[PDB]
Subunit: 379 residues, 4 copies
């Protein structure tokens, strides 16, 4: 279904393009093809359903004469369902123009405060007039949850990590705020993200939610195809085999972001960086979680300090010195390595490192700048 | 009203110099400040996630003094806290007093890292590996308490649904219009007055949670003192009596923000604006919800269109013309009314109007600007 | 040259799209076609040149084996020039990958802090070693001005209005901060903007600078084709003739933004809104400057107060009441007018009004809500 | 040092309660506060646009007292101001004292509208229509002065080029890295120390303009008191003498931000960090510019790679390993060094390193987490 992941990509790109480009896409695919992709997105982002009794909420999408109706069913502790049925008597209604809802789910930039949709709230009550205290309270909560799933309002990544139950926040690690600092500027971008290391898929769900325009790719040596869903593809590949990493990029890249949360075997960490850093988009970010295995013999680490050559912390110390390559003394001719030339910033926190890729060539300090505090006070 | 002033001082110090925050912590001491910080964490960490009774420790240290609290989180129960030893509690959070004051009551971007210490299950009941439940419940518990320890931007739409106010999710779709016009004040030490508590107080709790540095005032003719809590005061007064409005501003103001969600009686709406707009902070905002009563005879409205003089929509039309007062023809002798002079922006949406106060005096179009082809030809 | 304005539009849309879409565009057009469009943008945004003596700054762009060199000449009070020449001995150099510079000029989202470009600063001095105090100071300022013209760092619209010398700020009007409040959320969007009312073109230059991804359209009844340049097209049309307004939208729309700063003849103001409001993109903004003519008989206004029917302020009072259409009593059946149905917000300041377009259908207050303060205290 | 404390009080009041700002304006009075506000407007409106001698009036009123200033703008000349009558000056700006204090020294989104009054050429010298020059020069003059009256975000890259500092535009490309790591402090009442004034002071003026609410301290072994101005103090001290560093922090600190742009002598860089990092605000930032001297023997560096122990790059490598201190093998008896315990983030770019201070104590990976297939099999 690599024709089905290209259709979502096309809807996502048109959502941040010209009116003409969005008009040409909605013409070609039609309402009947696009609507179910939008309904899938609403179910995924409106979860979890509030603590309420089975309540129906209607969603209608219109585009150039055509209109399609869906009814969503919300109930405490249950998966939100949708069926293509008439709105009929359902007293909780949301209406969208197709172009508005595509921009509301997949558009970049500030969410719209007002005028993106129509709404009908209990204009008729099963009560007859003033609704039951239950019907009214459950009604507010139901239609609010669906509207929340219809947009791209900024989510709190700390809560998403607790909600999807990933170890990225709340005990073993405190990463998600640093992910907001370094990946936040890409939330609006149509990104392709690769997480090495997927039982599992929690963190993949979190990235699908955070990057509302993203395609999420989960790489593991074991099959995880049962996690596959819209904008979330799992791939089988070994991070210790350069040819399998290349095949992953050849098929699903290039990636704006690559996160190594895999085996944490020092060798694997080093191979994934050497192979994938060159394939990462310039201006993109490479992340390595779980630095601690640097010191664990069972992960190809050494239990010494300073960290032993060929361990993740030793690597981070060499990358750090690599950023200053232009200022280093070089006997005769020298060309900078790929990592010296393309790593413009290294962010080191407890148990995690962020590698900014970019052109690292500002030129070293000119020869005409004094190389002693002598010649300064002598001028 | 001596307990309101102590919180206000902790809030202001949180946004001041290191010297000013050092002076305050020295004067009041940890013992007096700590319970105020614990009260906020309980208020903002709510609600407990769907888990079994789990204990989380919060330790607060200042200049050699340390005080420990243990919080109890359980599915569907109010979060509790007791000043207890933390020795046997394997989920712990550690804060310096100046850090926890800024985290709760500081303006400025939430700190991503290094604000606190944390001990997560370094020891387990089993003593070799924690159960699937113990670990999962642990993550949720310490996550909920940590979210309560800071001022990370909340989604005002979700706050309205959580606090079960009618400001979002059916009758009204206001909260993003509030984010648009009040958002720039989230970091400010605001005093906000909401006229009409309506049982009730939902929107007061919403504003308390949104304005992490704010003092919230709920004004109603009926007693609502059963809602009173830290940073939330209810005042008994009538929005139809200018002297009772003035007494509210004389005691609890001035207000940065004033919202009219009261009786919606056209006369009351007009009296409240005439009395309180002149007392509102310059650069502050005055809001009128539920404009529809303009058309309801039972609210002192007229069921006609255009809206009848003395109804809220007619008032908003005259305010709109008032902003152009310098361009209107009149005698030089003309002096602008308080509203003509002090209303610089009027924002009209469905059933809500936002009034920006400021100096409306840029000068009318100079007399040397042509007014016809009569003047262009010369 | 409506094939030349479509080429810029294509470069702008690809700048905020997928890697594949940007790769396909740079392949089709090639470096030789794209580079001059990027050089034109750099000259336009690097102005004004600093108060310095004739200094040369080199800019090189590379894409898949091909590389093109340009040398820009900056001098106090003179137009910045560019020639396609070799960098040769020029000691002030900036290098870009084509894809980076397209995203840097036309990309949406946070400017890149680091790694977007290469630079060589006076590695050789005409001096021989430590440069002349003039050469060094002039060098800093020259290469800084060109780098500033190579990005999309947020400009201060108040300064742009003073720089291009438009009456939108600094005496007669104080508009530009309110334009930032209402149009700021579109700066990153590939917008088509129409200003009715163009001697002149100052404000058009300002919009081209502010919307770094925008196409600017200046409508006037007189010819202004001498102002035409990249992303800035002038059109001849009368704002009192609905058929000429339609022709403008048919050819160059739809517009995200429409500003009426024209004749200020009340009739013209009313005709432009009635015709163009329906053609404006939903979620878009319609602006009317110079409300004062409401009261000037020479502009079809009346010198009375309240303002006379058929004058701009009277219109703004009816639009304001129009937003509450659902709450108004309607004898028998009624359908809301286009303006009641599609105006979700009205912003009225001194001498200017902002009209937000959107779906205005939340439903009026349900019949089951009490219509007396009687039935409330009786429940 | 009594003049620094008066500005600090006006800055803090600007970000406090209406009551606190009312107390301060009452105590000091308009006569004492006004010249401080005029000094800022001259500093921030600079430079005058390319125009002929044009006069702009600024009137400041408080509780019935009003004081008028006339500013003179001319192409290539320092902007002047005199407390003069404004009767004959047709370009005028009017401000209430509380508004002009917030506009200059307030945190929070620049006010779009209603902060001030303005009179623009309601009367002309000609008395029927102003010349092309008179009008054009007027727009520019009153525009320049209005830009100086507020705190609208400046482009730190343009500030560096305007103030002619080497932090941007050739030798270094630092300023966007400063926007990234210091930007969240623009609104805060910071005390920033820049070690090394280098004639000089350009970067001090840049920081003064950027941190509109900040007090800027320039530390150098040579006298630089000729640069001293409002919100800008130069201190004589040696970054190689821990007792002289401590005296700087004891007199003018604590500092939110400390930048090392001094001698670049490896030993001095190490001594400055060892002494001042412990005194830096928690949640504050320590910056080291010009890492290249790591490799220069004339700076106490070694011309080898990897960098030699006791050189700046070796220090940064050890700090990086220091952040993982909890995961390193050692005896339980191990106690973390000040830098291991208090360095929570290290940001390395070309020739510059940013050190985040905070509590680095989240706990190392629990002992119950498997360390091999040896443990996975059980
Ligand atoms: Mg992990
Ligand atoms: Mg209500
Ligand atoms: Mg005009
Ligand atoms: Mg330097």
């Amino acid at each position: 279904t690599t024709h089905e992941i290209e259709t979502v990509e096309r809807i996502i790109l048109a959502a941040g393009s010209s009116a003409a480009s969005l008009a040409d896409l909605t013409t070609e695919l039609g309402l009947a093809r696009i609507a179910p992709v939008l309904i899938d997105e609403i179910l995924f982002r409106a979860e979890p359903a509030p603590d309420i009794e089975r309540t129906e909420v209607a969603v209608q999408i219109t585009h150039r004469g055509e209109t399609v109706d869906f009814v969503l069913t919300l109930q405490s502790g249950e998966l939100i369902k949708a069926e293509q049925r008439p709105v009929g008597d359902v007293p909780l209604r949301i209406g969208y123009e197709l172009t508005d809802l595509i921009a509301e789910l997949f558009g970049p930039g500030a969410p719209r405060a007002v005028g993106a949709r129509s709404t009908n709230f209990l204009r008729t009550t099963t009560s007859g007039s003033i609704p039951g205290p239950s019907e009214l309270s459950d009604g507010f909560q139901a239609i609010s949850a669906v509207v929340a799933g219809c947009g791209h309002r900024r989510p709190d990544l700390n809560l998403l990590a607790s909600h999807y139950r990933t170890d990225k926040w709340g005990g073993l690690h405190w990463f998600t705020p640093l992910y907001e600092r370094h990946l936040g500027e890409f939330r609006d971008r149509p990104v392709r993200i690769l997480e090495i290391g997927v039982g599992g898929g929690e963190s993949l769900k979190m990235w699908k939610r955070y990057f509302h325009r993203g395609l999420v790719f989960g790489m593991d040596v074991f099959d995880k195809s049962f996690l596959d869903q819209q904008r979330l593809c799992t791939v089988r590949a070994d991070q210790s085999k350069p040819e399998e990493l290349a095949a992953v990029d050849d098929k699903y890249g290039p990636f704006d972001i690559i996160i190594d949360d895999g085996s944490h075997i020092n060798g694997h960490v080093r191979t994934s960086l050497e192979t994938l850093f060159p394939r990462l988009r310039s201006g993109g970010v490479y992340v390595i979680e779980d630095l601690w295995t640097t010191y664990a013999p069972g992960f190809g680490g050494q239990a010494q300090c300073p960290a032993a050559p060929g361990t993740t912390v030793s690597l981070l110390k060499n990358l750090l010195e690599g950023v200053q390559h232009e200022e280093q003394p070089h006997a005769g001719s020298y060309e900078p390595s790929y990592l010296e030339r393309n790593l413009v910033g290294l962010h080191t926190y407890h148990n995690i490192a962020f590698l900014e890729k970019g052109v690292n060539a500002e030129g070293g300090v000119p020869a005409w700048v004094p190389r002693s505090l002598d010649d300064i006070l002598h001028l």
